[PDB]
Write a protein that binds this ligand. Structure first.
Ligand code: HEM
Length: 152
């Protein structure tokens, strides 16, 4: 389900993300590398990376484009944490190209964990961060299964 956050929880989310916000491309490159290294089955999902050793593709503009675009979305969700409909819209618009793509909830959840582990959050910030991410994944999965118009 979608469960709204308090203004304190909204604030904890912004604070949690702030080191990443100030280094979005850098952090994105590292997390995306770490995700494809830990969960290598996912690399084939990207036609542009398919068939290359990960270490050969990690320094390409294209790899960094892919990693950066993920982080831009989360940046925009964090910016919209206080606006349910605007947070939902960010997700709705990015969900479209993932629809009917053969990516499991497991592969998405695996990326979520790599992001989490990278942030080294204390439990107060982690709790607020997980409320936001639970909302993100609720919206995202509803949209993947053709129930996106509900958030309009
Ligand atoms: C859950 C966090 C994610 C976010 C915020 C995100 C975001 C985006 C964005 C903004 C785009 C660009 C427009 C588009 O083509 O959709 C995109 C495309 C794409 N997404 Fe993701 N995505 C996520 C997860 C994933 C995962 C885990 C996979 C694969 C195991 C994946 C596979 C793809 C592929 C294959 C494309 C097109 C690739 C290209 O040729 O450049 N996405 N995504």
């Amino acid at each position: 389900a979608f469960v709204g956050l308090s203004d304190s929880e909204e604030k904890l989310v912004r604070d949690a993300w702030a080191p990443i916000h100030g280094d979005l491309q850098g952090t994105a490159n590292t997390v995306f590398y770490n995700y494809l290294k830990k969960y290598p089955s996912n690399q084939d999902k990207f036609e542009t990376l398919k068939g290359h050793p990960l270490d050969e593709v990690k320094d390409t503009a294209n790899f960094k484009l892919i990693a950066g675009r993920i982080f831009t979305i989360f940046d925009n969700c964090v910016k919209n944490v206080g606006n349910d409909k605007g947070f939902q819209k960010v997700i709705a618009d990015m969900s479209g190209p993932h629809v009917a793509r053969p990516i499991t909830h497991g592969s998405y959840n695996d990326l979520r964990g790599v992001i989490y582990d990278s942030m080294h959050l204390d439990s107060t910030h982690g709790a607020a961060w997980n409320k936001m991410m639970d909302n993100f994944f609720y919206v995202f999965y509803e949209c993947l299964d053709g129930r996106c118009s509900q958030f309009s």
